[PDB]
């Protein structure tokens, strides 16, 4: 029953056969100290060529072997404040950081590793390796793990790798298409036969129940478009596009930085609590931003970019939310809504209601279905500002 | 997916109420040493008047008693090489041969009994009777059995029979209509709702699955028309029309004999292996038969009668098949296809596809049904050449 | 300059994007003593489920493990008369026969293994295994090999396989699409500038050279359609459809058998020497087959099926050829010719001639290109009669 801004702002394109294909270019250079990954929503995997940045694997350029080694790592997720390794415990895993920041405290907090960093190199070769620093995850993120035993097995598999390891001991174009499959929001509406036979003259309680069902389906559509793992702007956004606040509250400097990272930003999406926090920051700074009109409707904006409320963005127990800056379009590579119309029996252009059966208890069943998905044409189309403290007040 | 010659050659007539009636005349004369039977597909029963050929029942002409005695016999089937009775074992059954040939070897192979023969007469009267010959079934067939105890019970039932038996101890017209009931080929097609909602623009996978279902139904129709027991040309063919090969391979003399037994033969039906064997025999004899055109299609023929391949004719493990010679028509008494059109919801003139229900798992069910049967107006419309050796090669 | 029957008889269909897709159903049942394979032209691979017919692998039904084991076998080809294994040599390989016949002579010729047979079971488990029979390949064919070491490695990889092996020691539907890529026949025509400037009034020697080039390209097209390994009727034909002659000369019984295996055969393709041998056999048998008219052209035929000469079918040094029986069509699943028209610069509907450059020596270069391929919709569309002795004369 709430306002659905993402549904009415994202353009909808018609897929054929319930599938879509997006061609991805992944530019990456070796030697720069950062490992680049391939991300498919929430599932991530290291680029096989990038894997060569590791010294113990430098100058090895057999595509088969690198691909196998890349395939044998395991993805793990860590929450804020969770301890991953502890000082004193023997080291047996190589950790490649894909997202988040992790502060390492030695026996003296050395520094904080971030996206593209590695720790655990020496643990791979010798069995005497011991963790001398404690890594505490300051921010939630992902991390790839390469076990010593698996790499040893791969070494015992390829003779070329043995010889290269024994000898050492003494812009790249990568095309890989991404396939999007239409997800379904489905439900069963059970209407008693009496309610369909009698209550049908001045208003249809069947039609009113169907409208309520459609509204619930649309709310689920928005919640999935925001929070789903395979597709979904919160999770299926490039790791480089996700920024951290300088101080924690959503100061206007953070909004300027969020607008810096991409061209032609269309709008901001944030929780209403987050919008209140941004307004508090604006009042503290003493500036009054203008409001712009979209569709004959006035809306708060920053630098002319409208800020739209979305209640489906989660609020963490620590009262920290996130802000999304995103451009929409097909001619300009942005975010599109994949949706198939022309269904066999449409109550609405995107909907399909079909009579299922009548039970022995005289209850008619209807199947209400809609098919939807989201596509991001280029990586630099959605930026996310994370860990935004929304419970800060002037003191 | 194979060619269906029987479906496209048999004329189809429309039955009313799903039933058909065929009037049968069964001419039979007494005293000629052969017992005539009434055959309804695979179920056979002795004519009550013919039962009088037995000496111990000669001159008894009470219709009630003869009908009762005829009703109290049991039909049994025997395969090739199976031993039915053994020398030394006491005789307690009267056996009337309805089909097949059985060679009797005494203590010296006496002869071979055939259709209409009887053995076990004396076993009926006295209890001292003992089998002095071993009957080995050279060919598969049927056989009626009259037990001594049942006949004794019938004797103890009718006073007239007692007096006639005590005294002895010191062209007929029979009309009996045959009723044909339409059989059904039915199936359930389960199509997922997603496959019906999305995959429907450039080609319908629902329609393609329906076409595959229809093809499977047609294949089952042919297999039943050939091999079914109630109706079906292989089994519902007159015992006099079934011939045995003189040598075992399908020599052209056998085809001439098969064409001799009936007037206006329409075509031959045989397995493709059988057609290859016939071609081998033709090449061995040195004659090259002509080919005739039906429906603008050239086809091998013998004496101008086309020979059509049918893969539904079974091949026995001994590599022996059968050939069918049959005439089709309604104005000329032959073989007709009973089929009812004008169904409530027809995808095809003979078909009926109806939506059944949608399951809780969002699977749509369709019921695909067709109604069919076969009728043989006169006994001399289908002839069968049996035990045709199809694995014979020149040496 | 010769007659090109295959070019003018095969229907040509237009592919989109230079690629075609054929959906294959591979029905196979386990326990019947024959292993079924998947064939892609000349490359063959064992079905993973069929691999379970081996006792030492019976009841193991892990799809991953079976797929891995199937992937780790090696395909080998053997010619007629070549010895593969010898008596006395230690056994270290499991051999699965995919095509051809191999006679095994023990210390006494035991028998002849054929397609779907296996020999070398016990060699897999123990290292004491020794070949006690000599296998001589009577006919050319293929053979899959499974080494003992590879299977042992797979066992050491999967814990489930170890447990199943330790315990033992104490119709299936498989869909897999086939992709056809258009092959190219290309050439460069070098015409001197003087020949293009002067010899152009009454006849164009440039155009005459182009016609000769086109004829050579068409001859190469036919030779590839017949003899190519990836596609090509001689090699890309089902192993079950390939038959062996009963005696060696192409007797009419062999032609009858070749017509038996498939429905609606369109024509025969054979070398003119093979056609002469068939005519000699016909004269010896004393039968004179009729001739039929296609396209207003009379042609020899057998059972009404025209026999077309093709000089591109190889003749072996032993003077043995092969005969092809094949049906053509798209509505009836047969053999189609994949070809793309509408090229950017067409001299002919299927051709493309493009000016390349003019050399410093004043020689104009032209690029003449054509794109073609062959598709076989169903396995039972091409049958091959092999090892046909064509040098047999009456004596
Ligand atoms: Ca790099
Ligand atoms: Ca009689
Ligand atoms: Ca099998």
Q: How large a portion of the residues of chain A is in β-strands, by DSSP E?
A: 25-35%
Helical residue percent band of chain A: 10-25%
Provide the spatial order of strands within the biggest beta sheet of chain A. Answer: 15-24-20-16-19-18-17
Classify the oligomer.
part of a larger assembly
Bound small molecules, deduplicated: calcium ion
Shape of chain A: globular
Cα gyration radius of chain A (Å): 26 Å
Number of helices of chain A: 8
The assigned structural class of chain A equals alpha+beta
The major sheet of chain A is characterized as: 7 strands, mixed
Give the number of DSSP strands of chain A: 24
Of all chain pairs, the largest interface belongs to: B-C, 21 and 22 residues
Q: How far is the first residue's CA from the last residue's CA of chain A?
A: 37 Å
InterPro entries (chains A, B, C): cNMP-bd_dom (IPR000595), cNMP-bd_dom_sf (IPR018490), Encap_f2b (IPR049817), Env_Response_Regulators (IPR050397), RmlC-like_jellyroll (IPR014710), SrpI-like (IPR045641)
Pfam family, one (chains A, B, C): cNMP_binding
Keywords (chains A, B, C): Calcium, Metal-binding
Protein name (chains A, B, C): Sporulation protein
Q: Can you tell me about this structure?
A:
This is part of a larger assembly, with 3 copies of chain A (395 residues). Chain A is of the alpha+beta class and 395 residues long. Chain A has helices at residues 5-9, 63-71, 148-157, 159-169, 193-197, 205-227, 252-260, 272-285; strands at 12-13, 19-22, 37-40, 43-46, 74-78, 83-85, 93-97, 102-105, 109-113, 118-119, 134-137, 141-147, 178-181, 183-192, 242-244, 267-270, 291-294, 297-302, 305-309, 320-326, 335-339, 351-358, 363-376, 382-389. In chain A, strands 15-24-20-16-19-18-17 form a 7-stranded mixed beta sheet. Chain A is globular, with a radius of gyration of 26 Å. The two termini of chain A are 37 Å apart. The B-C interface holds B 1-3, 272-273, 275-276, 279-280, 283, 286-288, 290-291, 298-300, 309, 393-394 and C 246, 251-253, 256-257, 259-261, 263-264, 285-290, 292, 303-304, 333, 378. One calcium ion is lined by residues 28-30, 32, 34, 36, 50, 53 of chain C. The PDB classes it as virus like particle. The entry lists the keywords Encapsulin, nanocompartment, virus like particle. The entry is titled "Streptomyces griseus Family 2B encapsulin shell with 2-methylisoborneol synthase cargo in 20 mM cAMP". Chains A, B, C are Nucleotide-binding protein.
